[PDB]
Design a protein around this nucleic acid. Sequence first.
RNA 1: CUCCAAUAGCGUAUAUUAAAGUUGUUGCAGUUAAAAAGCUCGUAGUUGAACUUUGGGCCCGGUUGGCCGGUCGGAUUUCCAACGGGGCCUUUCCUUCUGGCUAACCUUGAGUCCUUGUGGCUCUUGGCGAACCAGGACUUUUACUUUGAAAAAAUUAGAGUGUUCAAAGCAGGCGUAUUGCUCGAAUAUAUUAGCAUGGAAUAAUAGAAUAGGACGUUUGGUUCUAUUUUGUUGGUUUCUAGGACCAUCGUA
RNA 2: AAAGCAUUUGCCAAGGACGUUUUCAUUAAUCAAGAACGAAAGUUAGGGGAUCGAAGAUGAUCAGAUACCGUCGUAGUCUUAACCAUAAACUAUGCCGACUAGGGAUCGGGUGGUGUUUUUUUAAUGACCCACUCGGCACCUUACGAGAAAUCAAAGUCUUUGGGUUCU
Lengths: 87, 129, 144, 146, 81, 150
Amino acid sequence: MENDKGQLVELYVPRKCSATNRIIKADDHASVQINVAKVDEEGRAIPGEYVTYALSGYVRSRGESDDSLNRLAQNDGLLKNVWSYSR
Amino acid sequence: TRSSVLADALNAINNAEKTGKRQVLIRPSSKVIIKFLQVMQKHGYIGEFEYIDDHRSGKIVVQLNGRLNKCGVISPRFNVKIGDIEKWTANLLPARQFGYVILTTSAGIMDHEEARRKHVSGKILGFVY
Amino acid sequence: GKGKPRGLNSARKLRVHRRNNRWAENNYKKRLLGTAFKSSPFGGSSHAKGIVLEKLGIESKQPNSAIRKCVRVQLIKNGKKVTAFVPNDGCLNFVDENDEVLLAGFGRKGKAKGDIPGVRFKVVKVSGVSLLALWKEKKEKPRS
Amino acid sequence: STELTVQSERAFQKQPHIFNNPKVKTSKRTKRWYKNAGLGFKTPKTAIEGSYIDKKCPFTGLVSIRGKILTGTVVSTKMHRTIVIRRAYLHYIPKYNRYEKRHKNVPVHVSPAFRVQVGDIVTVGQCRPISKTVRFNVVKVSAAAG
Amino acid sequence: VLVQDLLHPTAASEARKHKLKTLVQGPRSYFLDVKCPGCLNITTVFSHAQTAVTCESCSTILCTPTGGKAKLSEGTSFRRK
Amino acid sequence: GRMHSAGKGISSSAIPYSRNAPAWFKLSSESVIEQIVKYARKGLTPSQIGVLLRDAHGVTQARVITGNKIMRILKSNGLAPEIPEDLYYLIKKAVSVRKHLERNRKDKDAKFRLILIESRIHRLARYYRTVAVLPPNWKYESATASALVN
RNA sequence: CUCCAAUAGCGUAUAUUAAAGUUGUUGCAGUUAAAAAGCUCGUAGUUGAACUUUGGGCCCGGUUGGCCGGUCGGAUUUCCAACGGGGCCUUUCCUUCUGGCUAACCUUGAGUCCUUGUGGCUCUUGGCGAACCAGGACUUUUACUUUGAAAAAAUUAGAGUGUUCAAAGCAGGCGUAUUGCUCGAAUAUAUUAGCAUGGAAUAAUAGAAUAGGACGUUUGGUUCUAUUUUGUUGGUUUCUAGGACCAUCGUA
RNA sequence: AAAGCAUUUGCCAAGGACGUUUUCAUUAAUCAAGAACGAAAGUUAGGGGAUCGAAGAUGAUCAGAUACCGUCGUAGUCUUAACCAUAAACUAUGCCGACUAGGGAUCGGGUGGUGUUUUUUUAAUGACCCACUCGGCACCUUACGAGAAAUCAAAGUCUUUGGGUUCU
Ligand SMILES: [Zn+2]
């Protein structure tokens, strides 16, 4: 969102849930920012280099947070043969 | 009984956006539902949808991509003169600068914005945002 | 849903249903029954002149314990007898029997006011002058 | 409807000022006068070759078609040489933005050149006052049930 | 849940669903080719048959109607076609 | 749900996704027609020709192997009934209740259930007059109801 | 006594509008606050599943099809189809016989004026129907929507204008103020019904089932009719042309 | 359908659910007017003999007791024949349609099992067990949602306010 001259307004741009594509509000205290280590040969998790997922507090209350990360991480190559599209 | 299949379809979509789903299955399907989903698709409100061919009426599976707040139907389909459209967009759209009211003109099913530049009017179907 | 018809060819039902349920409204009924003309003591008028018949003392209802110093008046144009309150003190001395007072509503559009039971009217003018003037000694009551 | 032998009334039914001279033999038994009613309306073959008189007929008569051209559905044919049509319409009530169904009955005069039953979407045309209530004559007949 | 393939459900789920509640509805019944002991002719029998079907020859019994599938009588070899 | 009860059952047939006969059928499209009219001349209704043909002769359903519905074959052969079998079996049930209620008229439920059946007769005969299946008035009467079933 | 509010005005009464989403089409409420008929049938009324084809051009996105691999089974996209989609500028219309009428040449017919001449105008001989005349129509009717006309003035919104301001009013303003020049007095709204016009989505309606179905470039027939024409008018018939009706054959 | 309906047995018609590769093809939903059916309870004329209390008869209790308590008793849920149709006629929740959540029971129907049991040796059914499914009376846990709250899987999908329709 911007004015006529392209100057930015709207003092912050909010995070969005990576499962349901909805806005994380400033008062969603059940929302969670998952940080996953990136790894290289012979283990040795690289410090400070992540794969990050955000989950809204709606999803976690519904009990869908586990099934969401199984989809969210299998599509990124973090898992294999754990989440199945066809139920 | 079923009075309008468009109201059922838009109720099904609206219930699954709320729950967090990424797909719906609606039944039955009609040309009006196909065109209404096509107007929703070209503005980016829904993803891809596939039409399953029964021999009866067909079903549709529609992929949802978040970013949809409400799709609703207006019943009855009121007649809308070309000067009454800004009385509807002011009533049931969240702001003057996004959102669409889908009408049914003799030039076809279309949202209110390019009914204006086509300079046509007709009956009202509903709204999306 | 919503219990009312919605079809596009159903304007008659909505219009007749609005009409039937208008009668539950208090002032719509009185506008269309003519209750002001037939039933109200004034003939649907803000004011009416009368003739004083007697001085009355009405006990104020709870939790007040005063005597309210009103009068009983018979109107000219109708002949009906109403009770009207005589305002702030000493005015009951300024009113007497057969003074041809002028009456107004007592504020609440046909209802009693305050702790006075069953009085819907007040005196404005007595003998044709005022009560404010007589109370403030601005005018004098005619010798009658 | 029904019909009868044309000379059924007390007066001799004739087409006024149409003189068939008895002194000279002529093939046609009577001389007929018919007119084109106008407004793109075909005069039926029944009028040109028939034997009714009907001074109020749009064709072959004393009546001109001018004014409005209405159309309705025939609801009664009990009267003689006239019928009642039912024009239905929708009336808009702006407070509710809905409609209500309304109707009107228009008594129209039917010639003995058409045959009209209940049903029968008929196109009628305005003329001068024919009687207390009728101001219209039937001009075209279109059957509804086939 | 919240992400499913509604165009390709697994065959187990479609098999355990009701007949009309599948993605496309269809019959769960079939037709049977039965051999009565008497003659050797071809007789086609509905699995949920309602009439007491008999052969064209010697017409004994081939099945008895029930509230479900027809009960095929004592031993007559059956195929499913 | 049901028209005259609160039941909400969905039990029904389910036609397959095929407008063609199965590959194993291979009788003919015409010998079935002779078998249709053989049963009709025995006074069989279209509902009970189809159950007889499916159970014994292995036709899945008579439209997909012929192109015609069953009573269109009967009507083309001149074996159409006077009134539809849909309406005939409603009248026969109404005559059966009337005969029952004639002699023990203490059944307040057979008087109730008669009303539901007769209402269904009137709704269905209204439809048949509109689509010109029945003559334009035809006026189902109770006193002549028993005459039509036999 | 002091202070507050409005002020040449301020209080009181009755009515009415807002408040009032406390009349609810927008837009109320009905388990317990007021309110779901004891229950079911049922006519009017209201409402009612799905289904019937995409011609102008230019710019944009993909999705398939290859000409193309750059490369250790996947990695970029461009020139070309059309494949529907999108934005623009625009096409676009009426589907017919009788001739009126041809608008232009399909003409090039005989050569001319002027720079070596398709630079350049008059033109007959078949030869352009849309540019509209009058006949048949196209022929199932609507609802709906677009545009247009026609809609008294005053009131309303509103343009101009220093009535000294303003409410107003429709005036006025500039010279050479000596013998005159000139701008104004707009525009909008005016629904429902009627009229004229474009659209063909939505929602109805009709069609061919005992075929009395559609076409006809087939042949037998019946009746009605009389425009031109044999000068004439009227009576008749030869042919012509036109309906209507009855058989047969053809087509799909 | 409601009011309502419980040991037999036979007649007489009716009905939901289920199964169905049967048949018709929109015949449907809700419904002013108009109708059918209604707990009990006295319009109204055999019979059979009170356990209950109006009242009444009575005995207590009490300041009084015309009431509660005790004994008896006529009218008064048994005829054969109507209510005009009134109930806290209640789920104080109209009817039809669609969607949104997890579970374990149970009633009826159906499908499956190299299941158990009944005996002929298992067989055939029956009864049972496991799994699934359709349709019911319900229940348990939560609250994305609703509500003024109590609470509610509908009383949710409602200021992001429109599925159809009746009544108040
Ligand atoms: Zn055999």
